[PDB]
From a paper:
Reaction centre-light harvesting complex 1 (RC–LH1) complexes are the central functional units of photosynthesis in purple phototrophic bacteria. Solar energy absorbed by a circular LH1 assembly migrates to an enclosed membrane-bound RC, where a succession of charge separation and protonation events produces a quinol that leaves the RC–LH1 complex, carrying protons and electrons to a cytochrome (cyt) bc1 complex. The LH1 complex is formed from an oligomeric assembly of transmembrane αβ heterodimers, which bind bacteriochlorophyll (BChl) and carotenoid pigments and curve round the central RC complex. In other RC–LH1 complexes the RC is fully encircled by LH1 and there is no obvious entry and exit point for quinone traffic.
Here, we used cryo-EM to determine the structure of the RC–LH1 complex from Rsp. rubrum at 2.5 Å resolution, which shows the detailed organization of all protein and cofactor components, a preferential site for quinone diffusion across the fully circular LH1 complex, and a unique monomeric BChl, with a phospholipid ligand, in the gap between the RC and LH1 complexes. The density map shows the overall shape of the complex, which is slightly elliptical in projection with short and long axes of 115 and 123 Å, and 94 Å in height. LH1α His29 and LH1β His39 supply the ligands (2.6 and 2.5 Å, respectively) for binding a pair of opposing, excitonically coupled BChls. Here, the structure of the RC–LH1 complex shows that the spirilloxanthins in the LH1 ring are in the all-trans configuration, making contacts with the N-terminal helical region (α3-RIWQLF) of the n − 1 α-polypeptide and the transmembrane region (α26-LLIHFILL) of the n + 1 α-polypeptide. Surprisingly, we identified an extra BChl aGG, localized between the second LH1αβ subunit and the RC special pair. This pigment is not bound to a protein, and instead it is coordinated by an oxygen within the headgroup of a neighboring phosphatidylglycerol molecule. The function of this BChl aGG pigment, unique in currently determined RC–LH1 structures, is unknown. Figure 3 displays the distances to neighboring pigments, showing that the extra BChl aGG is located approximately midway between the BChl aGG pair attached to LH1αβ(2) and the RC special pair of BChl aGG pigments, a distance of 42.6 Å, with its macrocycle tilted ∼60° from the special pair. Four quinone molecules were identified: QA, QB and Qp are assigned as ubiquinone-10, based on their well-resolved densities. The head group of the QP quinone in the Rsp. rubrum LH1 makes lone pair π interactions with the backbone oxygen of RC-L Leu 76, and the isoprenyl tail makes contacts with LH1α4 and 5.
Author numbering:
A (entry chain F), F (entry chain 6), J (entry chain D), L (entry chain G): 1 to 47
B (entry chain O), I (entry chain I): 12 to 55
C (entry chain L): 2 to 275
D (entry chain M): 2 to 306
E (entry chain H): 1 to 257
G (entry chain 9): 10 to 55
H (entry chain 8): 1 to 48
K (entry chain E), M (entry chain N), N (entry chain J): 1 to 46
The structure:
């Protein structure tokens, strides 16, 4: 699998991956905040 | 990128992604213990 | 830092005022005396907008709104808390935009190019000045200016349009719209043609003026050519703004009724007024 | 005053000529003419036009659509030429009412609108194929057809794709001057003020941005036109002082700049995104958002009423 | 009402709007990459070493060279990474990176500031037919001035102070774009010297019967120093740049020089 | 009649003719579908 | 204007076999649809 | 009528014909879906 | 493109389209067994 | 039949087919989701 | 069928494929969240 | 993992971190100010 | 701290500083004129 | 930590800091003025 | 790839390691104090 780093420059790969993973993580935290059950800051009951 | 550099990068990359996934798995386990996210037939 | 070709152009001179004192760069930006006065008015007006947000009911960016004085003030200066803030921001914004135009002139002088850009930007300034100064002065109150707020200026557009029953029927507004749509059409065509000539496709050589002219002759039977399209594209954008200004100087200062009812002159023309 | 290069003072003439293309079924039609006033703004040559099979198809479909509209407009004033002129802007051909769904309505109750709309749609899509194939014949990129596809996407969204999502044609656009303006007014009011539709806000930003960019770019190329800047593809393939000074004016003004090629990509994308974001704003209306002001209140655009 | 909902608060229109913002950010990155196909990397203003303030987006900042294929069979790369020499015939008024340069000698002949030009190809622009595009009417017999217009030939050439620089002796026309690009002026001083005058640096004044080509850019003394061209019937892109830059410098330097 | 094919290019004739006849045929089928009596798919009664 | 006879004849064989297959499948499709629901109404409609 | 290929280019013929046939088929399927009797997905009764 | 490689492409193309149609045919069969899509006289 | 690949570029053919088949497939799945009977995610009864 | 990598550049293929697969996956998860039965975050009863 | 500075310019990494961390921190403080429970300036009761 | 003038030109710094201080002074006077307690020209009671 | 000035030009750094810190300070004072408890110019009771 | 030596990379990595540990140490202290003031994981009955 190490051959992938000859197809792609590791510098571009790491910055691209870090950008992708941050935006994905940020989306998931905002999605949870949009729910009642998982918004930890407002903290509704599990009725 | 030389084969020797690619193999060295892959070694560090493999170690790093497994640490990242290991920490994330621990984060998910704690969140599951707090509030699970698969509802039963009656919902939550 | 500099572009690979920049250094040879960074010569002294071309300032309108202030001499050598301001004739320098901060990174990529040229300063000049109108750079300083741009910053003066920009910081003042921006901080006064943020102050108006602190005075107002919400920090939600979309909802922030600094409002002109009540029409009951007429053209008097209002107290700061009662619309005077909007008045200071307005004239600071005029100062900032005028400084920006004059700073562009200095940059044109230094580069030996013509003054078309600050001249064209002068129509943006005149459109803003028409909405916040000329129209409310001719209507006799600052309270006819638009409020400075992301949604509230759109609310003012809505309120102002429906004040004349239906703003689509304003004839100058129809012509303004036509020129805005024509500008976007012409820009789409112009961007596409240059890119299609520069990027003919893999294994193809870059095309030149004969091909560029031939594409629009083949498709639509005319080509304005590479110089004409920049003349046209400029004139279209500036004419769209001029007719926008006219449509607003008509609505309120001159014509006060329903725009749908204005068109009834057409149906009353004697050769078909049965 | 120096020469501002707004109008060509002295203009030259030569034998009319154009780039070669492969022989088709149809030659280039018409005798090339020249007009003096077009030669002041731009090139003087009212050149020949290419027809081709796709051109025949598009014009035939389009002519039939225009006849169906025009005949219905004149029929609506009981064939009177005086009342036609008197009422022209107010005349329109209306889509069918909602009870017909997407089937064929009776001719007088919007069936003619459906036929005219289909024929106009087909003509426009054939004109897209024309704009595409004329570029390939000249061995040029297809950028103009793909820009045109964005305009078509809004046109189709207005006329057909949203009706398909709504299940009927009743809120489609009537063919008529003041009628299509009245449709625009009523559509905004029925869905709770289009100012609060964020994709309409995006579409406006790109509409304003297009006029901004063409004012900036048109003024820029004229400012460097005494340095050869109007010869843009030549400047793209061998950077002259005109392209250097255009870049530096904007860099020194606002801190950043394009190239002579890339400014045309900024131009292309802004005009495209105007109609693309427009089309999305139309397709979301009534299908997933029924009142845009209420959506705006939910998402913080306005205080709760 | 539940119609649009994705969660309690989240809905389809909101999701589609953030999908647009993600696309638009990616498009700006693409557009800024294209903007960097000329002039980059950035250099230190004083030393000319490759330096600038950069974040981690530097790694996506400059694109791989695209190759333009020219109809001569030559190519142009963008970025080509060629850059101007660090030394110029001028010195800074103050030692800071942001300071302006003062010309060491005559800036119009030293080609600094608005007299500066790009080192374009020493090749003429070509017609589609492969002939040189920009040529004197003497060599383009199928071209003519439209019968409605004043022909510039034989008119006096006059500066903004009313001194005669010379007379127009030919038009140079662009065969590809079908326009006048230069007037060929025989000078009044050193008679027999001929110089090119960019046509967009002129207008014809015809308020008085002996109509004339007025030139706002430079004064009559400066015409003797207009850059020369190697051939009598064609002009390279570099020679075009050199000539046009010289006149564009007149608005800043002609009352200095 | 054959002299017509020396006056007109047979390819231009057939393309124009095929275009015209398809558009006309399509128009007529759509017109009949826009009627009660002749819309064969809806199939109203002969009352 | 078109192709020389030999390759016109070559093309015409592959064309003719393809169009006959296409029509053959379409005829079978129309037959099955007719058996399901015919599309010519009687005097009283469907 | 093999001489039709002596009259028209087979490559542009096939591209045009394949496109025409798809558009025509798609139109007919859409027209049928717009009817009660022949919309197979909603499948109304013939009301016997 | 040569004759010999055009014949090579045609063989792999023929193999691929038969697999694609085979999977699609099985997909349609399972959907039909769940809910058929040709109604009877009384509809569904 | 293989001569069709002398007439059309195999790379363009595969790109064209893949684009066409995906857009067609996606259309048909969305059509079925609009129906009551075949919307598998909502799963209405065959009453 | 490994000859497909002589038709297509593996580098561009993987970028396009990963872009396609992510957007498809993201679409499918949002579709499920729009449903009552399969929205796991709101978790309605069956 | 000091080898990461053989991939990346340390100056660019610091510029990137400072930019990212400031905007992330500013986002989190603004999110908390939007809540009742964690808006320290308005200081609602833990009802 | 006199070394600061080996980093910044006295003439430029003085004009920039004078510009900054004037904007700051104007801002504060405008802020006070927006208040009840400190609008000296309106002169509300305490 | 003095090695930071071999990475970053002090002149650039000080201009960046001065701007950033002023904008931040001005933001924080305006935030407090928008509150009931900490607006010192209105001076509401606690 | 960054053009700095192994020695400069190791020198930077030492300072970087100390700096990020200090930054994360202050952040951990900040989070502990906020948790003592108002914890941010709700129980089943909410807050
Ligand atoms: C005081 C008053 C301040 C009013 C508000 C002003 C806001 C903007 C800030 C303006 C000042 C920035 C100054 C700066 O960055 O200088 C860098 C330079 C050292 O740099 P360097 O060594 O030469 O290297 C730089 C180079 O490597 C960077 O790369 P590159 O050269 O390729 O690109 C240059 C950058 C420069 O950008 C700018 O200067 C700002 C650009 C304008 C931003 C406007 C944002 C708001 C509008 C909406 C945004 C929208 C975004 C999407 O180029 C760019 O970044 C260009 C990006 C263009 C994106 C265009 C998108 C258009 C979309 C339109 C909307 C469509 C809607 C559908 O500095 C120095 O030399 C040291 C001395 C100066 C220190 C500056 C300290 C900070 C000053 C901050 C001023 C106060 C701000 C509140
Ligand atoms: C995404 C991978 C990578 C990643 C590490 C990274 C991160 C960040 N960058 Mg960036 N960027 C990367 C790559 C890259 N980058 C830029 C540019 C710019 C300029 C102007 C463009 C603009 O409008 O951006 C638009 C958005 C785009 C292009 C996406 C990245 C930025 C985001 C998500 C932050 C947006 C949030 C803000 C509060 C507003 C920031 C300030 C302004 C726009 C003035 C602007 C100052 C800017 C800000 C930041 C910040 C605040 C961050 C944080 C939070 O980490 N970025 C472009 C430019 O011209 O640079 C001189 C350009 O060429 C280019 C490239 C290739
Ligand atoms: C219920 C509402 C009703 C409804 C029926 C309707 C509909 C439509 N209308 Mg309208 N309209 C209504 C009312 C109404 N209508 C207008 C105007 C128009 C113009 C706008 C452009 C323009 O004017 O740009 C005028 C340009 C200006 C004012 C230039 C301003 C910018 C300047 C100085 C620079 C500012 C720079 C900074 C601050 C720097 C910031 C910092 C940094 C970026 C770093 C245009 C022609 C136009 C278009 C359409 C369309 C396409 C439609 C469709 C599709 O239905 N309309 C305005 C005008 O004419 O203003 C002079 C005006 O006031 C007004 C009113 C009240
Ligand atoms: C009471 C009115 C209300 C109010 C709140 C408001 C106000 C304003 N709005 Mg708006 N608008 C309202 C309603 C509303 N608004 C829009 C749209 C826009 C976009 C159009 C972009 C475009 O290029 O259109 C124009 C392009 C089109 C329609 C597509 C290209 C055209 C094609 C392919 C047709 C080719 C033609 C032929 C071959 C000839 C055939 C011949 C014959 C038929 C005889 C644009 C940006 C825009 C501007 C503004 C401004 C400036 C204002 C101001 C200042 O107030 N508005 C459309 C849309 O995209 O909405 C998302 C749309 O549907 C819709 C609606 C219903
Ligand atoms: C006249 C034809 C078109 C045009 C032309 C044009 N605009 C131009 C130019 C040209 C030729 C420039 O050279 C100049 C420029 O530099 O472009 C990058 C500019 C410009 N056009 C701009 C914007 C702009 N142009 C617009 C329109 C148009 N510009 C026309 C369609 C619009 C619209 C319709 O909405 C906008 C927003 C800027 C990007 C730029 C001018 C930058 C400038 O002046 O900078 C100095 C000032 C500041 C940095 C900020 C000052 C802040 C003030 C103190 C407060 C302002 C408050 C305001 C009154 C209220 C805001 C609230 C809103 C919600 C209403
Ligand atoms: C990107 C968004 C912008 C955009 C872009 C755009 N528009 C475009 C393009 C592009 C890039 C094109 O390539 C295309 C074009 O050709 O431009 C020159 C087009 C186009 N944009 C158009 C219009 C248009 N664009 C608009 C807007 C926009 N266009 C946006 C602002 C608007 C509006 C309302 O804002 C309009 C009205 C057209 C001029 C053109 C597409 C022309 C077309 O499709 O024509 C189809 C054919 C007909 C209408 C039929 C005409 C029939 C004749 C009367 C026949 C007469 C002779 C014949 C032989 C008779 C035969 C009789 C027999 C059959 C009996
Ligand atoms: C590198 O450089 C490049 C060039 O060179 C190499 C170029 O060349 C071009 C190409 C650009 C041009 C040739 C000129 C661009 C100019 C404009 C957009 C501004 C003025 C508008 C136009 C020239 C019209 C544009 C549209 C055209 C030419 C039609 C295209 C379509 C067809 C030929 C077929 C279908 C359409 C037809 C037959 C007619 C369409 C309708 C009109 C043109 C409008 C007619 C008017 C009305 C209907 C009346 C409306 C008004 C009314 C009722 C009230 C007022 C009354 C009036 C009479 C007005 C580009 C982009 C370029 O990059
Ligand atoms: C031939 O093809 C062409 C190209 O090229 C080849 C081109 O490129 C372009 C240009 C087009 C593009 C690149 C496409 C993209 C553009 C658009 C879509 C248009 C929209 C534009 C934007 C969104 C950008 C908006 C940004 C703006 C307006 C700039 C904002 C910046 C400032 C206000 C700062 C200005 C700086 C000044 C005046 C001086 C320097 C100052 C600083 C750097 C910062 C502040 C100051 C200090 C730190 C210190 C100094 C302060 C002092 C002395 C005062 C102190 C006191 C105070 C009160 C502050 C075109 C047209 C073209 O046709
Ligand atoms: C780590 C520990 C500390 C040690 C290190 C400390 C020292 C180093 C710090 C540097 C950061 C500060 C300088 C930022 C500018 C540096 C240059 C820059 O552009 O950086 C980007 C951030 O820009 C920027 O935020 C510039 C922002 C300028 C404008 C700021 C306005 C703020 C005020 C209004 C806000 C509200 C507006 C209204 C919102 C509704 C991030 O990189 P990025 O790769 O994308 O660059 C693109 C380039 O790499 C492409 O070639
Ligand atoms: C012969 O001499 C002349 C030319 C003078 C005759 C006179 C002509 C005149 C005067 C014509 C006047 C025309 C006017 C005034 C037209 C105005 C038009 C305007 C302003 C239109 C604006 C917008 C219209 C839109 C966006 C409509 C779009 C409609 C669409 C896309 C409809 C598509 C429908 C389809 C595909 C239908 C499908 C259903 C089928 C047919 C399959 O089954 C029922
Ligand atoms: Cl002029
Ligand atoms: Fe251009």
């Amino acid at each position: 699998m190490w051959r992938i780093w000859q197809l792609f420059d590791p510098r571009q790969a790491l910055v691209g991956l870090a950008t992708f993973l941050f935006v994905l993580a940020l989306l998931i935290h905002f999605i949870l905040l949009s729910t009642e059950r998982f918004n930890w800051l407002e903290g509704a009951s599990t009725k | 990128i030389t084969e020797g550099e690619a193999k060295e990068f892959h070694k560090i990359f493999t170690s790093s992604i497994l640490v990242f996934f290991g920490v994330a798995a621990f984060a998910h386990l704690l969140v599951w213990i707090w509030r699970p996210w698969v509802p039963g037939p009656n919902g939550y | 830092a500099l572009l690979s070709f920049e250094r040879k152009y960074r010569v002294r001179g071309g300032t309108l005022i202030g001499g050598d004192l301001f004739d320098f760069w901060v990174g990529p930006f040229y300063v000049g005396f109108f750079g300083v006065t741009t910053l003066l008015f920009t910081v003042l007006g921006t901080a006064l907008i943020v102050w108006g947000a602190a005075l107002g009911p919400s920090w939600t960016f979309w909802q922030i709104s600094i409002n002109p004085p009540d029409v009951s003030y007429g053209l008097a200066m209002a107290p700061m808390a009662k619309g005077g803030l909007w008045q200071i921001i307005t004239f600071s914004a005029i100062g900032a935009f005028v400084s920006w135009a004059l700073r562009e002139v200095e940059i044109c002088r230094k580069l030996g190019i013509g003054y078309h850009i600050p001249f064209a930007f002068g129509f943006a300034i005149l459109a803003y000045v028409s909405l916040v100064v000329i129209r409310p002065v001719m209507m006799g109150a600052w309270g006819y200016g638009f409020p400075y707020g992301f949604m509230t200026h759109l609310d003012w557009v809505s309120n102002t349009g429906y004040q004349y029953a239906n703003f689509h029927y304003n004839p100058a507004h129809m012509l303004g719209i036509t020129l805005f749509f024509t500008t976007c059409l012409a820009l789409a065509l112009h961007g596409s043609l240059i890119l299609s000539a520069a990027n003919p496709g893999k294994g193809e050589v870059v095309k030149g003026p004969e091909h560029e002219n031939t594409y629009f002759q083949d498709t639509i039977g005319y080509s304005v050519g590479t110089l004409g399209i920049h003349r046209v594209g400029l004139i279209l954008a500036l004419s769209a703004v001029v007719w926008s200004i006219i449509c607003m100087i008509l609505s309120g200062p001159i014509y006060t009724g329903s725009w749908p009812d204005w068109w009834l002159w057409w149906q009353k023309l004697p050769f078909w007024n049965h | 005053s120096e020469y501002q290069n707004i109008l060509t003072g002295v203009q030259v003439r030569t034998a009319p000529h154009s780039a070669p293309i492969a022989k088709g079924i149809f030659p280039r039609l018409g005798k090339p003419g020249f007009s003096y006033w077009l030669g002041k703004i731009g090139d003087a040559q009212i050149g020949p036009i290419y027809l081709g099979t796709t051109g025949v198809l598009s014009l035939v479909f389009g002519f039939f659509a225009i006849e169906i509209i025009g005949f219905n407009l004149l029929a609506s004033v009981n064939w009177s030429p005086m009342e036609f002129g008197r009422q022209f802007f107010w005349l329109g051909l209306e889509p069918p009412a909602a009870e017909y769904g997407l089937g064929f309505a009776p001719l007088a109750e919007g069936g003619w609108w459906q036929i005219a709309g289909f024929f106009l749609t087909t003509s426009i899509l054939l004109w897209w194929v024309r704009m595409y194939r004329r570029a390939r014949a000249l061995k040029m990129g297809t950028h103009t057809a793909w820009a045109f596809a964005s305009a078509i996407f809004l046109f189709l969204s207005l006329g057909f794709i949203r009706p398909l999502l709504m299940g009927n044609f009743s809120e489609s656009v009537p063919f008529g001057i003041f009628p299509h303006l009245e449709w625009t007014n009523s559509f905004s009011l029925n869905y709770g003020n289009f100012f609060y539709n964020p994709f309409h806000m995006l579409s406006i930003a790109f509409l304003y941005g297009s006029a901004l960019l063409f004012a900036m770019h048109g003024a820029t190329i004229l400012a460097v036109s005494r340095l050869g800047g109007d010869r843009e593809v030549e400047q793209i393939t061998d950077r002259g002082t005109a392209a250097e000074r255009a870049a530096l004016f904007w860099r020194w003004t606002m801190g950043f700049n394009a190239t002579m090629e890339s400014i045309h990509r900024w131009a292309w994308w802004f005009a495209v995104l105007c109609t693309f974001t427009g089309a999305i704003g139309i397709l979301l209306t009534g299908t997933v958002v029924d009142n845009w002001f209420e959506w705006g209140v939910k998402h913080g655009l306005a205080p709760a009423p | 009402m539940n119609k649009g909902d994705i969660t309690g608060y989240m809905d389809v229109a909101q999701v589609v709007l953030y999908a647009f913002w993600i696309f638009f950010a990616g498009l700006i990155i693409y557009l800024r990459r294209e903007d960097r196909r000329e002039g980059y990397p950035l250099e230190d203003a004083i030393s000319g070493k490759i330096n600038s303030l950069q974040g981690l987006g530097s790694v996506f900042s400059i694109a791989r060279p695209k190759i333009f294929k020219l109809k001569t069979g030559a190519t142009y790369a963008a970025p080509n990474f060629k850059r101007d020499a660090v030394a110029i015939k001028a010195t800074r008024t103050a030692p800071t990176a942001g300071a302006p340069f003062e010309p060491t000698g005559n800036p119009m002949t030293d080609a600094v500031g608005p007299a500066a030009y790009a080192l374009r190809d020493e090749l003429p622009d070509l017609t589609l037919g492969g002939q040189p595009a920009i040529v004197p009417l003497r060599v383009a017999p199928t071209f003519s001035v439209a019968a409605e217009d004043t022909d510039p030939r034989g008119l006096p050439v006059v500066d903004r102070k009313g001194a005669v620089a010379g007379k127009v002796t030919d038009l140079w026309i662009d065969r590809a774009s079908i326009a006048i690009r230069y007037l060929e002026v025989e000078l009044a001083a050193t008679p027999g010297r001929k110089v090119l005058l960019p046509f967009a640096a002129t207008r014809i004044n015809a308020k008085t019967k002996s109509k004339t080509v007025t030139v706002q850019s430079i004064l009559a003394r400066h015409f003797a120093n207009v850059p020369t061209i190697a051939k009598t019937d064609s002009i390279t892109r570099r020679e075009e740049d050199k000539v046009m830059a010289y006149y564009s410098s007149g608005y800043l330097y002609s009352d200095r020089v």
